[PDB]
Design a protein around this ligand. Structure first.
Ligand code: SF4
Lengths: 97, 180, 303
DNA sequence: TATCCTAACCAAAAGATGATTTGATTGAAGGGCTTAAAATAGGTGTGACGCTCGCTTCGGCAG
DNA sequence: CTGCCGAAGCGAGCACTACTGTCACACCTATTTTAAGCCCTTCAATCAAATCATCTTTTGGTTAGGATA
């Protein structure tokens, strides 16, 4: 309780960084699912739709070529296999580390 | 409306000091504030730099002895406010004021002025260590302003040979601002 | 030990649907004194384990439902207490404003209480005659009172004026029709004393046979509709034995109606414009409103 | 001798000099959002309205 | 057995609460580009205090450098 109180822009709160393997899953999802950010938010329960849109906005700055290359390398779609691939690869990443 | 009223009387008042009582938030109240002003198109001054410092500097507890501040921390207010003027005038002409939150400038200047008045006594202190004595919560940009201003003052320091000879740096430059 | 007393009371109440006297507690175990069991009962009433049934064989006690005792624990002590106020009100109910005003319980908790009691199918909110949109809270299983339902005439917080007015005009239509047809017999006034009158059951059967209103026309309702005509100066009343009609709407008796002629023609006074004049007090020969100036009279010259 | 003063200097107190380990501060990023513009779109919920002449009350005997 | 008129008592004008429902539209979804500023972790990059290893001066004290008593 004091009149010195600071006010500044807190809307940039600390969000969880993105993993390289998580990025690899993101690309195989563009290969596998498409650009339906709501659907991708469902395949990644740890990421919400706005996180997917921000991820796309960051990727498009340099990696448009990889976006297209993944999008043309199409794969049949299965949510269940997708979830298993995620947690297995994450567990493998932790075990390697 | 109360805010613009005070601005008409060039009466110093800051943004959060109002929002303190109103359950508001920066974006909510700032966006709305713009809305009425553009709606009414009334002429209103800006916050003039020197006005806010008088009330801000006077709020510190450095002017009397207390169990939290023995005398070595105590200081004369007139000297401090003068020194802060002689620093803030540099800040504006060196482009540092424009386009930034104004208050961090004041905090940085006051911290260093207070140190430089008794550097042998006060070089050992820090941002938060200083502020919590005055029960002041500090800007995080104040670190940015501090690094900026030390960078400036060393560049002044080299201009004088009888300052150049001492090979001044971050640690030592503080105790010569009275000279500069 | 009250701990023994409470458990015994609930168990005995489980096996006795008629209720248990306080003596039953001691009959099952003799060491229970009257004072301590009365003390236990006086707070079991405020805990929902017990409801008191006054009777000649001493006061009797009974339990209602598992959730009845459940919604007395902690802050829920106010819930079934509000239900106690409502079940005292029975089919009449109590407004939101009144429950706050009467019990002084916090309205914020009364909201939760209302929603939970409605969910449990215990109380329901109904709009009332007395204050229109002021909803009474009243027992879910019971039909609400006339002060809440307002009969067939009360509809959507308004009053079907056309419905009652058409009833009035049609019932006198038949009353005067029956009176004139009876007098057309023109044999003997002594038999006209009976023939001219109409039975309330008879006219109710006729008017419900017409079926003007899709809403039901009740016996006492039609009788009260007829009761407006006498005070309209239109009909007469006569009471006979109960054997008339299917109802016999009076204890050992039954009452009839008959259209009535007006005793005198319109008077001369009502033909005078001054009689109808509203500024009568202010009209003076000296006043600015005068018979030498009055417009009502000048205009009354023409037609 | 029986022992201390004190060169040389061992043995340790104690004094103290330096490189390193351990403990702490911090750059810059992650990434995140704001002023301002363009527009169509829909919902559903919020919240305007100090006496003292006059006057009062009920018993006690006449008639 | 009604009732007129007595004695005890009080008084005032002068004192240079609300709905409540409709309604209309604020509010939101939902994207693009600017610019600098502001923003929290978070480790990487960097810096600072205390400690361990060891040398050196003095207190103890001897050998041997030295001495009175
Ligand atoms: S205004 Fe004419 S009608 Fe009315 S009271 Fe006077 S005279 Fe009679």
């Amino acid at each position: 309780g004091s009149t010195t109180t600071y006010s500044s822009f807190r809307k940039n709160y600390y969000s969880k960084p993105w993993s390289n393997k998580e990025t690899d899953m993101f690309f195989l999802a563009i290969s596998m699912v498409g650009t339906d950010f709501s659907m991708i938010g469902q395949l990644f329960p740890h990421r919400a739709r706005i996180e997917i849109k921000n991820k796309f906005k960051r990727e498009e700055k340099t990696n448009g070529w990889r976006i297209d290359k993944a999008f043309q390398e199409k794969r049949p779609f299965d949510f269940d296999f997708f979830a298993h691939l995620l947690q297995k690869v994450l567990a493998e990443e932790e075990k390697r580390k | 409306c109360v805010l613009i009223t005070c601005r008409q009387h060039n009466w110093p008042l800051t943004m959060g000091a109002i929002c303190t009582l109103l359950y508001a938030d920066l974006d909510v109240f700032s966006s709305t504030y713009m809305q009425i002003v553009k709606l009414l198109g009334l002429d209103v001054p800006s916050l003039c730099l020197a006005e806010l410092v008088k009330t801000y500097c006077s709020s510190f507890k450095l002017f009397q002895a207390s169990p939290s501040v023995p005398a070595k921390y105590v200081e004369d207010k007139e000297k401090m406010l003068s020194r802060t003027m002689q620093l803030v005038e540099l800040a504006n002409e060196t482009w540092l004021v424009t386009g930034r939150h104004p208050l961090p400038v004041i905090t940085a200047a006051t911290f260093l002025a207070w140190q430089s008045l008794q550097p042998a006594d006060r070089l050992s202190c820090s941002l938060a260590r200083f502020c919590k004595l005055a029960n002041v919560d500090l800007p995080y940009p104040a670190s940015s302003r501090l690094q900026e201003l030390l960078a400036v003052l060393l560049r002044m320091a080299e201009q004088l040979a009888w300052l150049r000879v001492l090979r001044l740096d971050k640690r030592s430059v503080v105790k010569h601002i009275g000279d500069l | 030990d009250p701990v023994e007393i409470e458990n015994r009371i609930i168990e005995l109440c489980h096996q006795f649907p008629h209720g248990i006297t306080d003596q039953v507690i001691q009959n099952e175990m003799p060491h229970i004194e009257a004072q301590q069991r009365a003390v236990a009962i006086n707070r079991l009433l405020s805990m929902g384990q017990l409801d008191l049934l006054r009777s000649n064989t001493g006061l009797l006690y009974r339990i209602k439902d598992s959730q009845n005792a459940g919604k007395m624990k902690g802050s829920d002590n106010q819930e079934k207490l509000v239900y106690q106020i409502i079940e005292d009100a029975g089919n009449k109910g109590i407004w939101s404003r009144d429950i706050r005003y009467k019990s002084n319980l916090p309205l914020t908790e009364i909201n939760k209480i209302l929603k939970n009691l409605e969910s449990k199918k215990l109380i329901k909110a109904v709009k009332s005659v007395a204050a229109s949109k002021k909803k009474v809270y009243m027992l879910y299983n019971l039909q609400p009172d006339r002060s809440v339902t307002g009969g067939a005439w009360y509809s959507d917080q308004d009053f079907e004026s056309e419905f009652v007015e058409v009833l009035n005009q049609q019932c006198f239509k038949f009353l005067q029709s029956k009176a004139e047809t009876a007098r057309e017999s023109k044999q003997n006034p002594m038999i006209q004393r009976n023939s001219s009158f109409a039975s309330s059951h008879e006219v109710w059967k006729y008017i419900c046979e017409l079926g003007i209103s899709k809403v039901e026309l009740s016996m006492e309702d039609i009788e009260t509709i007829l009761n407006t005509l006498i005070y309209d100066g239109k009909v007469e009343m006569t009471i006979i034995a109960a054997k008339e009609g299917t109802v016999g709407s009076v204890d050992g008796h039954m009452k009839l109606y008959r259209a009535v002629n007006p005793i005198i023609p319109p008077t001369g006074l009502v033909r005078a414009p001054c009689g109808l004049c509203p500024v009568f007090d202010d009209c003076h020969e000296g006043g600015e409103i005068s018979p030498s100036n009055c417009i009502y009279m000048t205009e009354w010259l023409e037609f």
